[PDB]
Symmetry: D2
Subunit: 200 residues, 4 copies
């Protein structure tokens, strides 16, 4: 049961870096993108969201070239972002995949530098200003940025819905476990089809 | 490598509800508590930290009886807390287990009502006020409250050490998944022995 | 132009109505006495609370307290918290730290926890509880007009709440500081109202 | 005393819309800009900061055209921003004034939609990741965005230094009152000259 005036689709990091052949991180997520069909499922969800008047918010991650916005000695996941030169601002890799290119009305969330969309962006501000209380999440990575964003969403009292087949990760094991164990603690897990049915 | 003036031990939810026979949530965490020896490892870490002069911070979760500080219609993990009448303020369940009772000058973090300790407490305020930039995390649940806290601490630029043998969860597979896949993303995973050696 | 309040989406938030400010012998009471007296804030808050209960509106208290010795703060504070520390104000488990009797929390009132700074949103469970309960309108009162009350208003605003400031239920250490905050700052971040206006909206 | 490896200059809204003839809101701040000399003092501060190796971080405020990122029924100060059609993204007004144009190395904080730079941007994340514990603040508006940013900075444990002659408001009275009464509660106020000596 969805209220379009009080709902948003939040698309996390559908960027060529992940989504597209030649992306620095594409090879690592290919298998799961294939098994899930997340890309086409995401396209379908967005289409039904445009029609129902539900805003699309894209949340890309980017970094000024040289990574000066971060510690010179990162640890954990962002270390990989630095060493691999992923998501440099203004590059093909940082661009949102052509199939989901932002179009009239859509909101591109700004500032993302870490994994939790709510920790370095204007997402919370915009969601709250627009009176949105239900967020629908899709994107990358299932057990990293989608999971962090979902957990903070819950903390902040949104109704979080996670699109269990519009997410993808670097391994099927990591992907499946996130969805089976953690998603139910912090969200309402649903398929594109049921979200699509709910949007209509 | 640890600097005592700039380190905190953050002990999450060592409360009877989880730790003790009769706790509403004890049966769920019992197998993993026993498999890992978490209580005994935690007592060893805390003993060493006090010796080192490292402040010990307790982060209990509590709820005004009746759950009127929450939605009347919870979903996700907090639905079980309310439905199971867990962590009521002033009950034996809410009390910190006797083996880790706060002594002289220990800090007790106030406010927790959700999973991420940073989301509803004075933890950030106090760490920053004291100049703490490294946090050593232990407690319950591995894949819920510990992981949320770990994720937010990473986003806020803390050096987060996770005690791989001072945490527990409602299943062994869940516990193992978190430590193997997610902990390395947002923390420096360490055994208690490693942290003990670092503290001396 | 006339104010509508929905009881299910509304919360009175009372900042630091503790002896330390409100009552004779409180360490900071001398500094706020003139403005308390000028405004009649204490009685006015009582009348707004009473009406709030009658309409079923959550009353939320936001006291500030510190573990004795101030070991939860930097040893070398600056700014307004340096005065708290140096003055030994709001020590946990003292009369000064208690909420004032006239506004003692009764059955069902929420007592916000964690407060150690000035902004009520920065070190407590306030945001969590409001959002969990579905509150999107907070009515604000207490101390200090240009400090903690203003900080909470600013952040409230940033976080999408409809903030209402009770112009005659707040006080500061100076009438001049008080009046300036109310006339200049409050309208940028809030809808300032009187106790009487709020009470009428509640009924 | 200032450690360059632990300090950043944060410049709020040095955008043509305030600073320059033709800017929608320039008329309302011209008087105080003139009386303080804020623009030239800031250039001097930024130049000294560059020499010293201290990172420069500009925080512009922008909105996607049509103000759809916000409530359709704003109140308070943002209502004036929307009705005035100010700070529209990609327009000349939204651009940083030429004298303070970002130059190789400078960071441009992203996402600002509200008044407090901390509440809708990647400022905290970037400050904490780079290890900055002292922020030097200048810009617009003295009683609004500068005061909100300073209040939140202090809450978060930063040493906030406020440049009393590198800020401006719409009213001289409000400008002086904020500096006299509120700035001392939440910052160490200093003149540009005194900050430049410390930077030098």
């Amino acid at each position: 049961e969805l209220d379009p005036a009080r709902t948003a689709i939040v698309l996390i990091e559908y960027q060529n870096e992940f989504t597209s052949d030649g992306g620095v991180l594409h090879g690592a997520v290919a298998d799961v993108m294939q098994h899930t069909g997340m890309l086409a499922n995401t396209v379908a969800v967005v289409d039904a969201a445009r029609q129902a008047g539900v805003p699309i918010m894209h949340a890309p991650i980017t970094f000024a070239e040289g990574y000066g916005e971060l510690t010179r000695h990162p640890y954990g996941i962002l270390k990989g972002v630095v060493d691999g030169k992923a998501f440099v601002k203004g590059t093909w890799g940082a661009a949102i995949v052509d199939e989901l290119a932002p179009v009239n009305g859509d909101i591109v969330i700004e500032g993302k530098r870490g994994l939790d969309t709510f920790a370095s962006t204007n997402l919370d501000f915009i969601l709250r200003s627009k009176g949105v209380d239900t967020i629908v999440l899709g994107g990358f990575l299932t057990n990293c940025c989608v999971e962090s964003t979902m957990r903070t969403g819950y903390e902040r009292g949104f109704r979080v819905i996670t699109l269990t087949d519009c997410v993808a990760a670097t391994s099927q094991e990591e992907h499946n476990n996130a969805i089976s164990y953690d998603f139910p603690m912090f969200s309402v897990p649903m398929t594109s089809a049921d979200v699509i049915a709910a949007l209509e």
